[PDB]
Design a protein around this ligand. Structure first.
Ligand SMILES: *[C@@H](CS(C)(=O)=O)[C@H](Cc1ccc(CN)cc1)NC(=O)[C@H](CO)NC(=O)[C@H](CC(C)C)NC(=O)[C@H](Cc1ccccc1)N=[N+]=[N-]
Ligand SMILES: *[C@@H](CS(C)(=O)=O)[C@H](Cc1ccc(CN)cc1)NC(=O)[C@H](CO)NC(=O)[C@H](CC(C)C)NC(=O)[C@H](Cc1ccccc1)N=[N+]=[N-]
Ligand SMILES: [Mg+2]
Ligand SMILES: [Mg+2]
Ligand SMILES: [Mg+2]
Ligand SMILES: [Mg+2]
Ligand SMILES: [Mg+2]
Lengths: 212, 196, 222, 219, 204, 195, 228, 195, 196
């Protein structure tokens, strides 16, 4: 698994791979690792597949009850802390969860919170989580700046997953892209690594370690 | 420990050795392993001394309260109370109990209750670490409807052999005779039984 | 020490067409190297045009099916006889599974039926409630043998247009119920040849708008 | 694996199934498990397959050299001793479980050899994961001094019991009939299961696979 | 720390009409980390082809060892070793290390130059020969390969048809295994020509 | 020990190796050179178990130097790498195996080509355009997959390497005290002093 | 969590044209010691059901009391307790199966394997297995523990599939069961010669046979065995 | 987590806390503030088990802020430290103890004195002129034993602290990404931005 | 396993059951546990089949080579060779062997060799898992200088009981009679011994 999310000039980019493994068995290559909580909130899924899908779906219900009760969109800070305080209650029981709560509100602007199953909760501009995080960090860190356009930021997020999809055995399948702005999130397609790799190789002239 | 109970014509006799050990030290050489739970319902105790003592005390209490309300309990009823305690607390108990009693309707009866808390009604029963050495002997020598003197001899010879081979058994051979006549306590010393 | 789990073998398979869906399973039930039964069904009609199988530890599988069947019954009682849609069934099964997160149901669950647009639907669950809608899914002992074949024939994975230089892929398409049953039968005969826990018989439950039909076929008994 | 043997009136009938497994997967459906030791002695093999093949081959080689030196046919007792003493020395780590059967100057003999080096000398034996299924057939129907076609049928029936009821066993039934006048190596004796017929043709047409580069070299 | 699944990889061999095919993936990894996409697992000694899956240091060592042994063979015998004979040599050599084995899954493929007969064989890590009319599989996606071969394979395929069958068997099996893939090579072998093709496959 | 990297460009092989030697909660040295010259055009970097690393490096160095004197000839990088692999492949089944991972950077004077070999303690050898041992690879490989081209100059290679060290200095948990960089080309082995 | 102390071995059974047969030996083992030689392990419930139990004997006796208590409870406020609302095999089984699975799920199992054999109201044969894990299955032949390995192979030669049940008479089925019990006595170290057998037929009802013995024992070939 | 230091001088308490948050082989963040203001003149830094640290800090912060509102009064540093100690001393015999070590730097306005308290996860409290948690103490304590004087200014304290960070950056195995420094005195709590 | 050897007036008789097991499966129901190491020196085997078979073969070889050089070995000598193998390889052996032989000078002799490799010369010996159940019986019923028919009955009754209680024992009762007259093999089937 490789999930990333980063902040830039024109919002937040979120990109994830689509592979699910049971050891060395590739169980699926068409998996959804992004959860759409509300038009302004996204959640990423790394670690245990059930633990993430379940508790982030539940998170969306708790976010809905907040906006009914309070007549106002839940803050990213508050949404992330519902989840972090929940997992902390289960601490030591063996939940496996590495997640990013990404979203925009007027109050805080574009915001990303990293939350994990051992209780850690961190605000930040760049995060990569999963077995392929290091591979994604490598490409992302070395080509990042606030400057970036929306076209270039979408591509860098796409390219950073491709990098990890290639090197990490447990990452791959396809790349699901999301752009989060002041108006909400926008889906930017499912890109099969099978075709994307050869296209990126040809057009960019990279991946020279490969025969093709 | 070597314990047994044997039904015969006039009722039932219980028998036991008198040795208690911690490893190879004999903590008590004159132990009484035959214990009264009612006037004419007695038990032989094997396993953990603390467990069997605690069980026997609870059973004696139960049967005393039974008697207060419903009169004399059957030997089957006594065995059922032992079973209930042994079965439901199997994970925390090391107790092998033989229950023996005299009714006037049912005469002599023997129930054995091994480690799991199962119940088995038998003509005679043997138990304890020393019992292993006398299965062959007892099966060959037991007859139904023996006399008092024959049954005393059968128990005496049997426990004599159990004591001879088992290091965890020894001391005196105690017996308790349960008949319509009443309750009789018998003791037999090494100098008699060893040279049988 | 007492082990509360066991493995009863067997394998299951779900495929979804345009206006139908199949859920197949072999009828062999095993423990270790012994056969318990040659015909013990593990694919069930649960009502509301939903078929279900929970393959793995059969005691957990039966318990789960039993609870979901009961869940359908109470859904009718509490919501004016409303039909439980396949997506709502799926979400309900997640909660059944995740409720035992720290003492799991040792099973791989698969359900099949039609979605609210009349189109064929298959949903598959891990033992603790991670789920997904898919076209194809094999589960159980021989999943690893069957699943790569399905990828190749159902989804035309790895295959390109002749003479195109591997530039133009094969166009996917919907398969007929006849075509799908051919794939199911051949998937199971292959699995039977190469896996010791798979054999005896194959029971397929087919779901259309007209209800749930059954078909049965013999499999090698060695 | 289901392997078995019986002593009949004129000699020995050995039997075996043909399934070779890699965990839960069948690697070979028609695998030979009755091994040649000498012209008058054969050996069915269960347990670790490499250990079975290499142990019977080694003892077959050493018996050939023994027989060339002495100029007479080898005996089953010497085959038994050489297997036994070797397996004992390796304290069970060579996982060979053999049914050894043959016909000597002293008549027909049948042994079961275990990995730790114990042997039993018997009128009928079964080994492998399917031994209980096969032994049930022998306990049901075996009698001493059977005729040939009867003993053949009993062993075949005992292997079949293993094939169908044990998951570790399968495929065809191989027999080996050994007497003073002949040796009949029957492979296969019976095909109890037909190969499953496939309803579709899934073979891809030419040009379907995507190639990068090609190279041709003649010999 | 299971020696046979540290590096990953697969090999498959098939027979056809007067021909044989043997194929392998190109991955070498260290558990999750992909390290090399050029690590071929098929070698040849004259006209006899040997594929080896498993621990990569043992793959390399065994290749070097069988090159050594077949070179000496040819010098003394004054002829190239045949597949049936080589298969026996592989078995002997592996069983020599019975209680300290090479963690490998070798596969022999070739055509006997005297008889013209296509020959394939497989081995466990300890030397047990598995002969087959049809196909032999090996590696971390052996289950997947067994399923692909059992359903796709038919007898007496022409060299061009057999290429399509073996390639589709390998590719679809590799894509269901995390530790296999990263490129593939297929060898089509006729009585006196051998064609080596590299396959285009997904690189994740 | 810990970080060793290697990049093969058009005309040279560049090796970068971390300077820290840590034992317990103390960095004992910040200038350690984790490399041995095996021959004039062959360099070996090494990482792994304390003691084993230097002992193995120097043992290989002695053997190649002995060969050089005996034959009045320099072994090819391929030949040296195969000798090293075999020594490790023997070692892995010894009573006490060498726990040493190596990179071998060489310039083959007969072919006029740079060559980089990655060999682990098991004796697993691969020829690579770029290589790494340990956790370093998890960051660098993806980075090099992106930015590496096969026709780069030695200067372009050094910049590509700066990019790797920067990424490791940002994301690695441990302070490895920078790297010593060495270049192997047609003219032999030289050390970059200002990195 | 416990461990089984006093134990019973195989229970075997099969279907035939009009009903079912079930059998089990009369031994209560205490490890290798053949302690109790008069233990009944087939326990009838009404006149249409027999429950055969293997495994821990103390837990069997507990189950025996649950069934006895089930009969009492069904009779309460039930004028049709001996007719339309009598206990069925399927009811008795489902109860036990529920208990067994509940007990495994509390990590405190009843350490048994159970076969419920009977005939239903409509004449249908009932035969189904349940064990300490709550695992259940049905088959034309069923056997527990050791009998699964040796009895089933023999019994399956009489009834291999469903279609063989109408072709199998009560004589053929009883012969097969008694034959299987002989084979088990030769080969199971924790078995005994003395056994009980129970036939539940749709026409002739429940026949319960006690104090049967294995006979026709082939031991003659033993004299000709000299060394190893 | 990892490095937390504290120095009490004449007129102020200075806390220095490392900025790195590492999980596995990745430094996830290099700007983490490992501190909570408990009251206007009391600051608590913390290190230990992931999750537990912030959860404990914020829990203490809520309780002291609740007290402040209820009594319209600021608890003394001594009082706050005793409250914190007791919470940890309860925790150590719970089903799941808080694995959190803290320093509490405060200025007592009634005494006009700076105060520094070191408290470990067991509930072991000491008042100190200088304190540290974890491996940091093994380098800093001896250094401060030498260079510390009780009458130092806040500027002298900051230089003394620079000396500690320099020594840790030289000899510690891990990259802790520098420190955030905060000063507690008569005028409250402020952050030094350029360290 | 239940094995024994008993000295009597005319020599010695060895006895054994015929059951070999792997757990609760009976691998061989017709086993021969009485094995010839010399013309009139035999042994009863208990413990690991593989160990006892390997030991007996080595002893038979040793005594054959003894005979070639020094003539007929004594029963004591045979027991000493067994002991030497059992004692020196105690860490790698599970063998309980009774050695029994007939000399004309010494008549019948029995030596038992338990797990440690100690040697004990006795009037009679019992061994194997089933022996535990007949210690009591055998001690009560053994007499010195019995006849052939009495000794056959003593062994038959004893092993009958050992078989009855031990699950690891069963099948037929084999016996070997060692006298001046020669070597006689006896077999007794279940239908005879079970109903004793
Ligand atoms: C990558 C994260 S990683 C390799 O860096 O740990 C993915 C992230 C992910 C996948 C899928 C989804 C949503 N569907 C969300 C996030 N994680 C995985 O692939 C994990 C590996 O840890 N896989 C699983 O959780 C799998 C999912 C199945 C569909 C294959 N399930 C299991 O591993 C369980 C484990 C289990 C639990 C109880 C009893 C037995 C076994 N099932 N299995 N096997
Ligand atoms: C049945 C015996 S059984 C299942 O009842 O124990 C067969 C007997 C047999 C088959 C074929 C031959 C060939 N002449 C001889 C005897 N045994 C098997 O099928 C065994 C199962 O245990 N299979 C093997 O030994 C296989 C050989 C296959 C390639 C064909 N080998 C493995 O499974 C190895 C075993 C092994 C050995 C040492 C260390 C680790 C593993 N597994 N692997 N790898
Ligand atoms: Mg990958
Ligand atoms: Mg099958
Ligand atoms: Mg041994
Ligand atoms: Mg792959
Ligand atoms: Mg017996």
């Amino acid at each position: 698994t490789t999930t990333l999310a980063f902040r830039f000039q024109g919002g937040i980019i979120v990109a994830v791979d689509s592979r699910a493994t049971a050891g060395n068995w590739v169980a699926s290559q068409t998996v959804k690792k992004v959860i759409e909580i509300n038009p302004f909130l996204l959640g990423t899924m790394a670690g245990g597949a059930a633990d993430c899908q379940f508790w982030e779906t539940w998170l969306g219900s708790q976010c809905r009850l907040h906006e009914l009760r309070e007549k106002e969109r839940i803050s990213v800070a508050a949404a992330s802390k519902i989840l972090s305080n929940l997992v902390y209650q289960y601490k030591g029981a063996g939940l496996s969860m590495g997640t990013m709560i990404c979203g925009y509100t007027r109050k805080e602007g574009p915001t990303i919170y990293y939350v994990d199953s051992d209780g850690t909760r961190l605000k930040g501009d760049i995060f990569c989580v999963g077995s392929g995080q290091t591979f994604a960090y490598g490409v992302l860190d070395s080509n990042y700046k606030w400057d970036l356009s929306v076209e270039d930021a979408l591509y860098l997020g796409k390219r950073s997953i491709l990098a990890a999809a290639h090197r990490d055995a447990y990452s791959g399948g396809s790349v699901n892209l999301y752009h989060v702005t002041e108006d909400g999130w926008i889906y930017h397609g499912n890109h099969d690594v099978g075709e994307l790799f050869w296209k990126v190789k040809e057009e960019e002239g990279s991946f020279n370690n490969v025969i093709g | 420990t070597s314990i047994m109970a044997v039904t015969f014509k006039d009722g039932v006799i219980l028998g036991a050795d008198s040795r208690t050990t911690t490893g190879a030290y004999i903590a008590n050489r004159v132990t009484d392993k035959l214990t009264r739970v009612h006037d004419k319902i007695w038990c032989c105790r094997s396993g953990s001394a603390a467990d069997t003592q605690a069980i026997a005390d609870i059973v004696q209490y139960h049967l005393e309260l039974y008697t207060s309300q419903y009169g004399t309990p059957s030997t089957e009823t006594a065995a059922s109370v032992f079973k209930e305690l042994c079965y439901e607390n199997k994970d925390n108990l090391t107790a092998g109990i033989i229950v023996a009693g005299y009714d006037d309707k049912n005469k002599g009866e023997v129930y054995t209750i091994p480690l799991g808390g199962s119940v088995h009604k038998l003509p005679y029963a043997i138990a304890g670490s020393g019992s292993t050495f006398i299965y062959g002997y007892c099966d060959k020598n037991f007859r139904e409807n023996m006399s008092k003197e024959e049954t005393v001899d059968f128990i005496k010879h049997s426990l004599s052999q159990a004591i001879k081979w088992d290091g965890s058994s020894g001391g005196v051979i105690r017996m308790v005779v349960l008949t319509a006549a009443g309750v009789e306590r018998l003791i037999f010393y090494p100098d008699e039984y060893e040279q049988l | 020490q007492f082990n509360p789990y066991g493995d009863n073998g067997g394998t299951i398979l779900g495929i979804a067409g345009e206006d139908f869906a199949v859920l197949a399973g072999d009828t062999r039930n095993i423990t270790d190297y012994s056969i318990n039964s040659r015909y013990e069904p593990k694919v069930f009609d649960c009502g509301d045009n939903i078929v279900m199988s929970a393959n793995g530890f059969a005691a957990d599988g039966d318990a789960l099916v039993k609870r979901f069947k009961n869940s359908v019954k109470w859904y009718h009682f509490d919501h004016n006889d409303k039909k439980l849609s396949i997506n709502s069934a799926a979400r309900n099964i997640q909660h059944l599974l995740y409720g035992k997160r720290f003492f799991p149901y040792y099973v791989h669950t698969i359900i099949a039926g039609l979605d609210e647009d009349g189109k064929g639907a298959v949903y598959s669950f891990d033992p603790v409630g991670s789920y997904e809608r898919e076209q194809c899914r094999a589960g159980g002992a021989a999943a690893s043998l069957i699943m790569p074949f399905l990828d190749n024939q159902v989804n035309f994975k790895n295959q390109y247009e002749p003479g195109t230089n591997g530039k133009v892929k094969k166009p996917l398409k919907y398969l007929s119920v006849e075509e799908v049953i051919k794939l199911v039968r051949d998937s199971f005969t292959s699995a039977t040849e190469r896996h010791i826990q798979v054999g005896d018989g194959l029971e397929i439950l087919i779901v259309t708008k007209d209800g749930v039909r059954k078909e049965f076929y013999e499999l090698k008994r060695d | 694996t289901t392997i078995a043997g019986v002593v009949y009136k004129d000699g020995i009938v050995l039997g075996a199934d043909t399934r070779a497994t890699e965990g839960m997967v069948v690697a070979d459906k028609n695998c030979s498990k009755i091994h040649f030791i000498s012209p008058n002695i054969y050996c069915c093999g269960a347990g670790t397959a490499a250990d079975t093949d290499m142990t019977t081959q080694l003892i077959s080689s050493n018996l050939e050299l023994h027989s060339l030196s002495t100029g007479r046919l080898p005996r089953v007792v010497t085959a038994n001793r050489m297997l036994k003493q070797m397996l004992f020395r390796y304290q069970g780590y060579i996982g060979a479980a053999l049914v050894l059967g043959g016909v000597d100057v002293t008549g027909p003999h049948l042994y079961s050899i275990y990995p730790h080096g114990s042997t039993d000398k018997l009128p009928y034996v079964t080994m492998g994961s399917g031994s209980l299924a096969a032994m049930a057939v022998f306990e049901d129907k075996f009698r001493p001094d059977m005729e040939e076609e009867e003993a053949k049928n009993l062993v075949s029936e005992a292997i079949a019991a293993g094939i169908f009821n044990d998951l570790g066993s399968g495929g065809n039934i191989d027999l080996c009939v050994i007497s003073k006048n002949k040796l009949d190596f029957l492979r296969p004796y019976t095909v109890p299961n037909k190969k499953g017929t496939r309803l579709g043709r899934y073979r891809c047409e030419k040009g379907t696979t995507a190639v990068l580069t090609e190279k041709i070299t003649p010999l | 720390s299971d020696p046979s699944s540290i590096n990953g990889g697969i090999v498959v061999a098939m027979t056809g009409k007067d021909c044989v095919a043997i194929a392998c993936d190109l991955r070498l990894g260290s558990q999750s980390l992909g390290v090399s996409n050029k690590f071929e697992k098929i070698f040849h000694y004259g006209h006899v082809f040997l594929g080896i899956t498993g621990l990569a240091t043992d793959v390399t060592t065994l290749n070097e060892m069988f090159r050594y042994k077949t070179n000496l063979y040819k010098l003394k015998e004054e002829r190239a070793i045949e597949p049936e004979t080589f298969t026996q040599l592989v078995s002997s050599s592996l069983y020599e290390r019975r209680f300290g084995p090479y963690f490998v899954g070798p596969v022999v493929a070739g055509i006997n130059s005297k008889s013209g007969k296509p020959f394939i064989a497989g081995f466990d890590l300890i030397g047990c020969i598995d002969e087959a009319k049809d196909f032999i599989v090996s590696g971390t996606a052996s289950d997947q390969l067994f399923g692909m071969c059992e359903s796709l394979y038919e007898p007496n395929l022409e060299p061009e048809d057999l290429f399509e069958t073996i390639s589709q068997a390998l590719l679809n099996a590799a894509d269901r295994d995390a530790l296999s893939g990263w490129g593939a090579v297929v060898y089509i072998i006729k009585k006196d020509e051998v064609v080596k093709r590299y396959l285009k496959m997904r690189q994740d | 020990m810990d970080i060793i990297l290697g990049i093969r460009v058009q005309d040279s092989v560049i090796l970068a190796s971390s300077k820290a030697v840590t034992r317990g909660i103390s960095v004992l040295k910040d200038s350690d050179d984790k490399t041995r010259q095996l021959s004039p055009h062959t360099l070996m970097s090494f990482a792994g178990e304390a003691g084993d690393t230097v002992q193995f490096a120097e043992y290989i160095q002695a053997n190649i130097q002995l060969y050089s004197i005996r034959e009045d000839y320099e072994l090819s990088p391929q030949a040296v790498s195969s000798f090293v692999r075999q020594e490790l492949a023997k070692s892995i089944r010894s009573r006490r195996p060498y726990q040493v991972n190596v990179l071998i950077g060489g310039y083959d004077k007969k072919k006029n080509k740079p060559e980089l070999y990655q060999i682990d303690y098991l004796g697993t050898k691969v020829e690579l355009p770029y290589g790494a041992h340990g956790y370093s690879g998890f960051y660098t490989f993806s980075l090099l997959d992106h930015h590496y081209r096969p026709d780069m100059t030695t200067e372009e290679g050094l910049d590509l390497l700066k990019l790797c060290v920067q990424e490791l200095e940002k994301r690695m948990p441990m302070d490895f005290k920078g790297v010593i960089v060495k270049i192997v080309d047609k003219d032999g082995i030289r050390q970059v002093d200002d990195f | 969590t416990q461990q089984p102390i006093v134990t019973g071995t195989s229970v075997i059974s099969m279907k035939y044209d009009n009903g079912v047969i079930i059998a089990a030996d009369n031994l209560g083992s205490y490890g290798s010691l053949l302690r109790f030689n008069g233990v009944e392990r087939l326990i009838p419930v009404g006149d249409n059901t027999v429950v055969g139990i293997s495994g821990d004997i103390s837990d069997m006796q507990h189950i025996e009391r649950l069934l006895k208590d089930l009969v009492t409870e069904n009779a309460y406020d039930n004028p049709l307790a001996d007719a339309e609302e009598a206990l069925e095999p399927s009811y008795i089984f489902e109860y036990l199966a529920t208990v067994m699975y509940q007990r495994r799920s509390k990590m405190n199992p009843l350490w048994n394997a159970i076969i419920v054999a009977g005939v239903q109201s409509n004449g249908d044969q009932f035969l189904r297995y349940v064990n300490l894990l709550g695992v259940t299955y049905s088959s034309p032949t069923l056997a527990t523990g050791f009998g699964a390995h040796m009895a089933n192979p023999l019994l399956r030669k009489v009834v291999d599939r469903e279609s063989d049940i109408p072709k199998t008479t009560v004589q053929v089925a009883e012969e097969a069961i008694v034959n299987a019990m002989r084979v088990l006595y030769y080969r199971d170290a924790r078995s005994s010669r003395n056994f009980s057998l129970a036939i539940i037929d749709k026409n002739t009802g429940l026949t319960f046979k006690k104090n049967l013995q294995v006979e026709n024992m082939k031991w003659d070939f033993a004299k000709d065995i000299k060394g190893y």
